[PDB]
Amino acid sequence: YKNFEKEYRQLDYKVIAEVKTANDIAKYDDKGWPGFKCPFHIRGVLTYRRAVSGLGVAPILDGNKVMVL
Amino acid sequence: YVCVDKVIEKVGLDRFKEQNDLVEFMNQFGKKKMEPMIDVAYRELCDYMNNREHLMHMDREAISCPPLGSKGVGGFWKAKKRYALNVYDMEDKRFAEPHLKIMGMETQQSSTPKAVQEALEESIRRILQEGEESVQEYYKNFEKEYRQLDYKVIAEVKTANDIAKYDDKGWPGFKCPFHIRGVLTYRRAVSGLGVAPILDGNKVMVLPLREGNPFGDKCIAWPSGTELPKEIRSDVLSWIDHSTLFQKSFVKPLAGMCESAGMDYEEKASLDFLFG
Amino acid sequence: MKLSKDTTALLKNFATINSGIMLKSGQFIMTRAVNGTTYAEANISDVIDFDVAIYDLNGFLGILSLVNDDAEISQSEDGNIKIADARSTIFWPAADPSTVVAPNKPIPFPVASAVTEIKAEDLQQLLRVSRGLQIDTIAITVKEGKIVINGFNKVEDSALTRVKYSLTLGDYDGENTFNFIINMANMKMQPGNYKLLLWAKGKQGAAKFEGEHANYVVALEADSTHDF
Amino acid sequence: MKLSKDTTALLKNFATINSGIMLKSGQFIMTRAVNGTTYAEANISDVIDFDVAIYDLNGFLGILSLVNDDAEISQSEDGNIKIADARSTIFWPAADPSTVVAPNKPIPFPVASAVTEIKAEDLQQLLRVSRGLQIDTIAITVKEGKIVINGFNKVEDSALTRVKYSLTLGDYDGENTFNFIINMANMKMQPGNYKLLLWAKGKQGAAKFEGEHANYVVALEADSTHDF
Amino acid sequence: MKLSKDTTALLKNFATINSGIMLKSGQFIMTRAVNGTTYAEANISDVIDFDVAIYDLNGFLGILSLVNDDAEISQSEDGNIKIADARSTIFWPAADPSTVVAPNKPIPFPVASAVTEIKAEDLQQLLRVSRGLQIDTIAITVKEGKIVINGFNKVEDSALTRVKYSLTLGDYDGENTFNFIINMANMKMQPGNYKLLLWAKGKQGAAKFEGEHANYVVALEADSTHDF
DNA sequence: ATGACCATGATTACGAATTGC
DNA sequence: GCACGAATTAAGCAATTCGTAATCATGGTCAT
């Protein structure tokens, strides 16, 4: 446990990232903001989508390797 | 619907003489200026994908404008497809009087009494056409008048099922529903008085009670349409006078509209004018 | 800086008006409610070294009162506040200046339309009956020729029909008749003598309770009616 | 009408007995439980000049406690309760007598099957130990020529076997064999040397409680056994 | 039993440490925490003639408070606890010794690797400010030749590196630098002058707080870095 | 002086909704 | 969906997230 805690922070964030499937990218949220009860992953999905408005990156496609942090 | 307030501000409100001048300006502005722009900007669509021919039309279906000189908002949105507009001209038909046009508001839902909906629609008419003082004074006038109607029409109705799940000698149970608590208290009130018992599956009309009522509970329930016994009729009327229930019926929608209308109904007086 | 017990008591009373306050460097301490219904001012012998945006005034004063009186309060290296006793120190965080709602400018309360005086026990009795009679509204009025106080329960009587409580404030000299309506929730005075300065204009107005330690400024409800 | 500290304290005890109360003109004041298990009577030091029905007694007690004793209590212009001193004035509505429950007449309690004396300190010790030990039942009996009181909780001891308290009242002279069961949800008194007069014939009886200024009556449980 | 007021306070402290205690015969008492992270003992001035296990103490303390200090407590004939005052007799249930968590023999504290003297006011100030500064552990260590205590919130710093509140004790004459750590939840001592005795060999370690009344032993943690 | 009582966070539990196997 | 048709397999929930209440520790102020 102590060794794993030691090496947990220093490693790359992708190999600890909880990567999941984006199923309902628009069913729960009202308008960008997670309007109704929002799944843990969908809140992060909309967070990143609203973070990159005009940043020139391809927005999320459903089923992508979206990782929730 | 496109907001055209900027052009009206640019030309000037004071130069007009009657509201008909305002509507006539807003009318001919679309035809002289907007309509040819619509035609050219859709012909550019026809050219973009080199389609066959241009067939789209677009004319001023409705012009919304506040009454001339009045403080009135003159129309406001609330969310996707819930607006309100003091429409003055629909399909090139001048209206001698303002024509109210609303959709999606909470003014037509069946769960509220007819007086509640009429008051909501009058508040809409004020907040659109009349000024703030109008909506302010009407709120308190309807607050005074609102308790001066029958108790049964105001009170809502719910369906009670599985009473035995949520009863312990009449007291509330685990997450006891409002109707269940009310009906249990009612059964405790008139036990053995000969009235028809209230069982599951029957649609029952329910209203709360103020704190400190002699029944010991903040609810009451009895079969809908039916009239409760006269002996408990007096106090239940006296112990619900000027209740807060209409905050759950009329004040909440009124706030939901007025907040989006850039106004507040009950004047929140403070020291802000001293700070500046 | 150096903080004395009377200043701490004044600060604790001010904490009920708003959770957080801003101690701008100087001698004039002053705050306002989060909703702007009331404002408070005071002048204390101790001066303030620098502006700090203390958030939990209750917690800050609670931890402060547990150490010696002559504890020294100064800026820590990270921007927080350091309070050092003769043998120990405590590091209390200082929040961002923005998150604390503070009055940008001290209010120069001008000359009032009417003046009067209230004794220390009157406020105690008034607050106690409001706690007991569930009084929701206080009305400063003139009855019989004397300036008097009336108590109401808006929760039930929205038209202030039943005068649940009455108090004869004192003598009136003038012809202006008024009903100043004030809330109980915004009445956060501390016990003692007070000097009431009342002013009305249009639909609004103010009342200032001047005291020997701190002064308060309170607004009037819409039901207040003035007649000059 | 005027009231004193002792009168207000015993009125507070009466409020613990019942929420509402009746005030007959004079000195002699009655109250009884809603179910009527217990009754209480007091002769106030003052004199009552009107008959009134009171619903919320505790609020009245708080008001009369916080106000000066020189304040006068009388009937308001609308037939309600008006409490006015030289400074303030408080209006409290009087409830309809139908809604409240009052005793029909005092119970003379002519005969006393058993007579005993209980000290204030022993009574308070019993009260506190019963609160600590969760005792809701007292059995008063005589063993070996000694009047004793035993604590019992019928929830856990319906057979009345497990004894948690032994309160020896004193010495008994006689061959009468009595055991009376009383439930804690009724009696409420101020600490004072007190007299107890038990009586029970067949299935009907009561216990009168004599104090230096006030008296009570408690209906004995039917399960009490009596051989007189 | 003849339990003095000081003895009652000591067993109140033990009750805070552990709900159930055993009164071994003599003039000595001891206990340990339910999870076994804290030990305590006391050389009381009252004699004990037999062993008895009690599940709850706060109620027992209240019952002892109701009666005089001179009441005699012994083993009841029905396998319970009998308390006899000048008038009153009290029955208390007896628990099985195996059903109560308690140590076997008194702790022999090893040689104090470090010695410090924590004053009453400083320790009590630390305890009061613990809740204010939401601290959950404290590190006693060496800084510029002084033995000091620094409070750390484990929730917002798992590495225990963010100072929030620091208090000094006195000069340390040694080069054995170390950074101990103590869980604040185990600080359950009566406010007074105590002696800080630190022992640590390799992984094993402990601390002892000897007051003029009793003695406590708190367990160190594996995160403590010590070297002598 | 000391807890009493009321108000305010922690903690637990369960209905309700939804998707995951 | 007209006009049936001729053959037929996914079950029932484990788990999370949220809201609202219910109960429980804990502090502020008060009669004492």
Numbering used by the authors:
A (entry chain C): 761 to 829
B (entry chain A): 623 to 898
C (entry chain D), D (entry chain E), E (entry chain B): 1 to 228
Passage from the reporting paper:
The T4 replication system centers on a holoenzyme complex that is assembled from the DNA polymerase (gp43) and the sliding clamp (gp45) loaded onto a primer/template junction by the clamp loader complex (gp44/62) in the presence of ATP. The sliding clamp plays a crucial role by encircling the DNA double helix and anchoring the polymerase to the template. Sequence analysis reveals that T4 polymerase contains three main structural regions: an N-terminal domain, a 3′-5′ exonuclease domain responsible for proofreading activity, and a C-terminal polymerase domain. The T4 gp45 sliding clamp forms a trimeric ring structure, with each of the three monomers composed of structurally similar N-terminal and C-terminal domains (NTD and CTD).
Three-dimensional classification of these two-polymerase complex particles yielded three distinct 3D EM maps, designated as states 1, 2, and 3, with overall resolutions of 3.57 Å, 3.7 Å, and 3.74 Å, respectively. Notably, particle distribution shows nearly equivalent populations with bound DNA entering the right polymerase (state 1; 54%) compared to those with DNA entering the left polymerase (states 2 and 3 combined; 46%). In both states 1 and 2, the DNA substrate remains displaced from the polymerization active site in either polymerase, with the primer 3′ terminus positioned 16 Å away from the catalytic residue Asp-620 and the finger domain maintaining an open conformation. In state 1, the left polymerase thumb is elevated 10 Å higher than its right counterpart while the left polymerase thumb residues Lys-797 and Phe-796 bind the duplex DNA. Concurrently, the right polymerase thumb establishes DNA contacts through residues Asn-783, Asp-784, Lys-787, Tyr-788, Lys-797, and Phe-800, which engage the DNA minor groove, while Arg-704 contacts the DNA backbone. The primer 3′-terminus remains excluded from both polymerization and exonuclease active sites of the right polymerase. As the polymerase exchange progresses from state 2 to state 1, the duplex DNA tilts by 25° toward the right polymerase allowing the P/T junction to approach the polymerization active site of the right polymerase. The sliding clamp adjusts its position to accommodate this DNA movement, and this repositioning causes the original left polymerase to dissociate from the clamp.
